[PDB]
């Protein structure tokens with residue numbers, strides 16, 4: 001008997017039901033969310049949260065847009081920073097601090113990301129950071145240290161690919177993988193407030209991936225998650241969301257490693273991309289639904305909920321107090337990867353928080369990356385096209 005059943009039963013008896021629309025399709029993220037809600041719902045009398053799976057994150061924001069057009073929004077939903085920006089155009093979001101939710105002790109990396117015109121409009125919930133996944137067995141077999149620099153990373157991917165007879169750095173040709181190389185070659189998306197997809201660091205980053213494919217050390221993954229492709233050919237490394245941790249653990253037929261990202265120098269790990277979502281509260285919710293949202297958001301920010309959620313998933317605990325919780329401490333003491341994920345969370349960069357950014361990242365930038373990697377499009381030409389399509393979108 002599944003948590004979503006327990007929850008359906010809880011909400012059946014409840015006087016007030018606050019819907020939480022989410023983008024978790026399964027595995028540990030879905031189960032840890034459902035587990036959190038079952039615990040919250042047991043402490044209420046006649047008050048519940050009902051989680052509603054809307055598919056993936058793209059499906060979720062499409063369904064929220066349709067909810068506005070139909071005039072029936074949930075109480076809460078997951079949202080990226082750029083989704084928050086879009087919902088704020090429609091004035092659709094309640095300021096978090098007005099609900100009475102205390103945000104002292106939320107990591108400033110995550111809080112700064114939800115603050116628009118000095119006003120917090122989201123509660124960091126499931127915040128991920130990119131990490132280096134690696135094959136501990138394969139690096140040991142060839143006496144290869146974990147690479148700490150981009151230079152060591154490329155040298156390691158070449159050495160191991162030559163040794164195993166195939167490309168060992170696995171990557172999706174997408175905006176997220178691109179962000180890692182872009183950021184760590186000195187790139188920035190905003191130049192004097194204008195969005196720039198075709199800067200020389202963008203050309204450099206997309207060139208490095210395309211050269212990695214041509215040179216036989218980088219393997220493009222075109223069908224499924226990297227962790228869904230494991231077992232076909234030699235794997236040494238990938239740069240991927242911390243929220244992949246349970247997926248990689250379940251799939252890997254090798255000893256899985258987690259490290260901090262290779263940086264420009266050993267002075268500091270490389271910057272990871274922050275992904276995952278914040279919880280927003282819709283103004284259209286009733287006072288009674290908003291009160292359930294307030295208690296639910298206080299629960300989600302509690303040290304125990306954060307300790308359980310983050311240790312179940314590989315998401316980053318969003319509060320100072322979660323790291324001081326004995327349940328977090330017990331898992332960390334048993335598993336050095338949790339500390340590795342927290343350490344990487346200190347070296348964190350975000351994509352632009354523009355309303356149009358969801359469209360741009362997948363349909364424009366993402367497509368330019370695929371053109372370059374999959375169809376050998378010239379990197380500059382592919383990014384010049386992306387820039388123009390972005391400029392026309394931002395004009396329209």
Ligand SMILES: Nc1nc2c(ncn2[C@@H]2O[C@H](COP(=O)(O)O[C@H]3[C@@H](O)[C@H](n4ccc(=O)[nH]c4=O)O[C@@H]3CO)[C@H]3CC(O)(O)C[C@H]32)c(=O)[nH]1
Pocket residue numbers: 023024025027029057058061080082083126127128129174176225227228241242243244245247275276277357358361
């Ligand atoms: N809609 C929209 N999406 C965005 C935006 N910025 C980034 N992203 C996407 O965030 C995903 C990272 O979010 P995260 O919560 O860290 O991790 C996800 C999953 O990625 C990961 N997962 C799921 C199944 C699996 O087999 N393996 C696995 O790792 O588990 C989590 C819950 O599904 C990336 C993934 C992407 O689909 O390629 C597109 C990326 C945006 O602005 N909008």
